[PDB]
Amino acid sequence: QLLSYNDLRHFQIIWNMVDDKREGVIPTFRVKFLLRLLRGRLEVDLDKDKLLFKHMCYEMERLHNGGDVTFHDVLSMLSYRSVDIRKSLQLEELLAREQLEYTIEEEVAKQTIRMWLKKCLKRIRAKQQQSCSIIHS
């Protein structure tokens, strides 16, 4: 039910394969390339866990606003998400985790809506300026 030594070794190998240097930190945008390459017990199914994968991506993106994240941060995130938090956490920590994940879910949903707005607003940004030109003309 918990992270095993083999899982930690595999994750370290994958990190060393995606982290070209030995700086111990990678740009946040690269971190998704970590999650989907991870294999074995920690593998995530893109055909069934799309929502979970996006949730993890934005959770680590929100932890530091556009900042670079260290190995320990991603390790701890996977460690938390690999356990039944309701059983292995204290009351206050469980409440904090639940609130954080709920906020992340809502935030990512409205971020998809933000992309939808990007498209729709780009479409609608023509009529008003055309009317502006007509008024000027």
Binding site: S131, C132, I135, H136
Partner: protein
């Protein structure tokens, strides 16, 4: 067996055979026969036989659904009938209709919901999530639950039992075992509530000693305890589509001052509905929005009078989650908009974006907009800034951050409109009067909220209130500052002064009430002065 079973199940009595048939063939009935049959159903509502009463109630409900105008007119005529007997009979008929509302659908052809359409209730309100307060107080020793040093236990049980209120629940609706039922109570019957509210004050006595007021009070008390939402639905939804706040608040105040109490569930539902109404009105700008919010706040402080599980922490957390919390409590901190966008008198002209600090009068913004738009000094007094969306005309000396506390990505949109100075002054007077009344309502609401809390938790509540009050950025200015410039106005100055004296008195009362709650050895610094 066959004949006996049939007579015992399918034919309870021969009298209600015809009426019941009309229920079975309700969809085929034309609008004319509904009106033709309405008088018989209305008259047969008081029959001693239960089957006849139920059949008549169902038929009348279907008639009301199909022809609301006729039923509404008949009800209004009966409630305003000259003789006492007719009014008392109408009240009894309403009670019978209310208690027979759950037995309509079974009486007609099976699966008639698809062939017969009842419009779903229309509500634009989003009730606060989570629910603000306890839905009800459980009885200490319910005699209708199977579950469950001896003498002490019995003494404790008796003492706790004395403190409860058995008459405040729908007794017969709670004992029944719980192993769906649909209620058909069209909105045109709920209108009958208001006549009963008026009748509560009718002292006429029938020859057998029954008084109209007593029967009306009993019926409405039973209705409120059984299902608060069903009775208080046709009013809450209706107010959204029309600007009749005054009448509805008058009616609710009469209800409060005639029943003399509100059971926990009724006050809970009313408070949640009113809060949701305020949230919707602030949410969706409308022509009569601010007036509706002021009217609702003017009465909310009485609804809060009877609520059990309302605590400061839960209310603050949930209302902040809704994020439109600055219109209810006074201990609300919200960073205001950093920038403001304003259009000129003409259309499609180059707008302007201006900065906003925390101590900016509208006078400076008006001056900057006036000078930037190349306007002669002679007509300076003829131009005023106003919000078209919310239809607000703005006072010169009100802070930007106070009127637009929302720190969203979207800055408020203003317009520089030209009009006669007298009309502008009158509109400004009206709007500032309404806003000051709203502020008084908020203070009263907080007073009522903090005047009913278990004495054990009162110290914690008062300490929390003091902390939030101290951490608010501009509290002494908010509670002390007044719009002096408008007092000199002869037409409306007197009213504003008379309402401001009341506001100041309520503020003094709030601080004194808060002071007494805290301990007698609180470590005070210089910040005491701020209070």
């Amino acid at each position: 067996s066959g004949m006996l079973k049939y007579i015992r199940l399918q034919v309870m009595s021969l009298s209600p055979a015809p009426l019941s048939l009309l229920i079975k063939a309700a969809p085929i009935l034309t609008e004319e026969m509904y009106g033709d049959i309405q008088p018989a159903a209305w008259e047969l509502l008081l029959s001693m036989d239960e089957h006849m009463a139920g059949a008549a109630a169902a038929m009348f409900l279907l008639c009301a659904v199909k022809v609301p105008e006729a039923v509404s007119d008949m009800l209004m005529s009966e409630f305003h009938h000259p003789e006492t007997v007719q009014r008392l009979n109408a009240v009894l008929k309403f009670h019978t209709l209310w208690r027979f509302r759950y037995q309509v659908w079974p009486r007609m052809e099976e699966g008639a919901q698809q062939i017969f359409k009842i419009p779903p209730p229309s509500i634009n309100f989003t009730l606060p999530s989570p629910v603000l307060g306890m839905p009800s107080v459980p009885m200490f020793d319910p005699p209708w639950v199977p579950q469950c040093n001896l003498q002490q236990e019995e003494e404790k049980k008796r003492l706790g039992r004395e403190a409860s209120l058995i008459t405040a629940i729908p007794i017969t609706q709670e004992a029944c075992y719980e192993p769906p039922p649909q209620a058909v109570f069209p909105a045109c019957i709920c209108a009958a509530v208001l006549p009963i509210v008026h009748l509560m004050e009718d002292g006429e006595v029938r020859e057998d000693g029954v008084a109209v007021s007593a029967v009306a009070q009993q019926v409405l008390w039973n209705c409120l305890i059984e299902d608060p939402s069903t009775v208080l639905r046709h009013f809450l939804e209706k107010l959204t589509i029309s600007n009749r706040q005054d009448e509805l608040m008058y009616m609710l105040r009469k209800l409060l001052l005639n029943i003399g109490d509100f059971p926990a569930q009724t006050s809970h539902i009313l408070f949640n509905y009113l809060v949701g109404l305020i949230m919707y009105f602030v949410r969706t700008p409308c022509e009569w929005g601010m007036d509706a919010i002021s009217a609702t706040l003017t009465f909310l402080w009485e609804v809060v009078g009877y609520v059990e599980g309302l605590f400061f922490k839960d209310l603050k957390q949930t209302m902040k989650k809704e994020q439109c919390e600055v219109k209810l409590l006074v201990t609300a901190s919200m960073p205001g908009t950093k920038t403001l966008v304003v259009h000129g008198q003409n259309e499609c002209d180059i707008p302007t974006q201006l900065p906003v600090h925390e101590d900016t009068q509208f006078e400076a913004l008006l001056k900057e907009c006036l000078e930037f738009f190349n306007i002669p000094e002679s007509q300076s007094t003829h131009y005023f800034l106003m919000d078209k969306r919310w239809n607000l005309i703005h006072y010169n000396k009100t802070y930007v951050r106070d009127i637009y506390p929302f720190r969203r990505s979207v800055s408020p949109q203003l317009n520089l409109v030209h009009m006669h100075p007298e009309k502008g002054q009158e509109l400004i007077q009206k709007q500032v009067f309404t806003r000051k009344l709203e502020e008084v309502g908020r203070v009263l609401f907080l007073i009522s909220l903090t005047q009913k809390i278990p004495t054990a938790h009162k110290q914690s509540h008062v300490s929390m209130l003091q902390e939030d009050l101290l951490r608010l950025p501009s509290f002494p200015r908010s509670a002390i500052d007044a719009e002096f410039s408008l007092f000199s106005d002869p037409q409306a100055g007197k009213e504003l002064f008379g309402l401001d004296t009341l506001q100041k008195s309520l503020w003094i009362q709030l601080l004194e009430e808060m002071f007494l709650g805290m301990p007698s050895e609180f470590p005070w610094g210089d910040e005491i002065m701020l209070f």
